CSV table of C-alpha atoms in Angstrom, one decimal:
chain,number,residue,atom,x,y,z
A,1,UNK,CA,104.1,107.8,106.1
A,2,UNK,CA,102.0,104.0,106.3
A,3,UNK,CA,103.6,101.3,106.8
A,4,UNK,CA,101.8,98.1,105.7
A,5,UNK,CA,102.6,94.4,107.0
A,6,UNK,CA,100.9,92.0,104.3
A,7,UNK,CA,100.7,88.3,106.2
A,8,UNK,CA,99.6,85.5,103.6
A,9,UNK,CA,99.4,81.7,103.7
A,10,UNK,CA,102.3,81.4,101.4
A,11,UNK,CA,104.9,84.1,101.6
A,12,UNK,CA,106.9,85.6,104.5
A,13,UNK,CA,105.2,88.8,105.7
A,14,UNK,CA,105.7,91.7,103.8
A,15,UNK,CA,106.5,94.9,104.5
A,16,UNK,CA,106.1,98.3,102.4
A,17,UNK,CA,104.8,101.5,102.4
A,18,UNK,CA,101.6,102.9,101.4
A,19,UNK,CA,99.5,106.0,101.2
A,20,UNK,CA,95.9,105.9,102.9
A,21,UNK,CA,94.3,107.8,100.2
A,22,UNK,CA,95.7,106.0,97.0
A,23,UNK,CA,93.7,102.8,95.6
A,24,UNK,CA,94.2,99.7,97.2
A,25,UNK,CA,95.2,98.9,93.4
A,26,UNK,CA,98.7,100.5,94.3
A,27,UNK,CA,99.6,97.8,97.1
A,28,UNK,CA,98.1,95.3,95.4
A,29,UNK,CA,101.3,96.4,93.0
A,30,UNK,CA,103.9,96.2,95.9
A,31,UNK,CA,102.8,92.8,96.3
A,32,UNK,CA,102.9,91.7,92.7
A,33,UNK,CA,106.7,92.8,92.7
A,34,UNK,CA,107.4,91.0,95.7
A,35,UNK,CA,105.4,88.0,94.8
A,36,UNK,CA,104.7,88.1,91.1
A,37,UNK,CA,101.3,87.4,91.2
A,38,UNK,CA,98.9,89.4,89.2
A,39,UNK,CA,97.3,92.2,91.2
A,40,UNK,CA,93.6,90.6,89.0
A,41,UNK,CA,94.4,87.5,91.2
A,42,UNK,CA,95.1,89.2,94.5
A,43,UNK,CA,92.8,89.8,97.1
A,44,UNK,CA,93.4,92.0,100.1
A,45,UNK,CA,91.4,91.8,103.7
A,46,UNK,CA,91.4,94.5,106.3
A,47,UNK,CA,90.0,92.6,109.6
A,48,UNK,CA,87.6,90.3,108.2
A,49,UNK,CA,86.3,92.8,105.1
A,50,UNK,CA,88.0,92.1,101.5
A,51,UNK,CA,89.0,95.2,99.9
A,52,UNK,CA,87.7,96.7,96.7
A,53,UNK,CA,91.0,97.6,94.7
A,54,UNK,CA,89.5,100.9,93.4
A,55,UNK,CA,89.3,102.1,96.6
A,56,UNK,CA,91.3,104.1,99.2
A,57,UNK,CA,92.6,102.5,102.7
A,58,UNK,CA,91.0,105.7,104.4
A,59,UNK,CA,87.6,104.7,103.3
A,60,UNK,CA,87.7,101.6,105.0
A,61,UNK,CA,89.1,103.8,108.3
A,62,UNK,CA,92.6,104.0,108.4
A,63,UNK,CA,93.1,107.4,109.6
A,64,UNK,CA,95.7,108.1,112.4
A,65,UNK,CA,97.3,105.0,112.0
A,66,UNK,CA,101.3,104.3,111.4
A,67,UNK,CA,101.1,100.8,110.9
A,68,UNK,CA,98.4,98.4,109.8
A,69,UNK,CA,97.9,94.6,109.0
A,70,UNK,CA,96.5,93.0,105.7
A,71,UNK,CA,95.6,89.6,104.3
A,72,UNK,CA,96.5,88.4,100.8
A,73,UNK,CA,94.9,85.9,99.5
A,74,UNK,CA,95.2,84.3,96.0
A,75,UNK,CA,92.1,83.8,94.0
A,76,UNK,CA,91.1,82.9,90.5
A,77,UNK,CA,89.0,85.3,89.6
A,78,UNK,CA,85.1,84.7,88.8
């Protein structure tokens, strides 16, 4: 299906796969199992624009894509 490389300050990249039409909520997950940190204090980039975890990958324009790249970064929350 997706394939999704997750590059962080931290970690070794990560690799899993995803769905473009589920949340982002349900990488955030992947990440949490791989990194145990709470998908509250996770934030994801595509490019340069942070993801909202309700929403899909296809809404920010992953379409025809096979692979794609994403930052994590870990934030205390507001």
């Amino acid at each position: 299906t997706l394939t999704v490389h997750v590059r962080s300050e931290e970690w070794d990249l990560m690799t899993f796969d995803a769905n473009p039409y589920d949340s982002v909520k349900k990488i955030k997950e992947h990440v949490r199992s791989k990194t145990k940190v709470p998908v509250q204090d996770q934030v994801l980039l595509l490019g340069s624009k942070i993801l909202k975890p309700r929403r899909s990958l296809s809404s920010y324009g992953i379409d025809k894509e096979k692979t794609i790249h994403l930052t994590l970064k870990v934030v205390k929350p507001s």
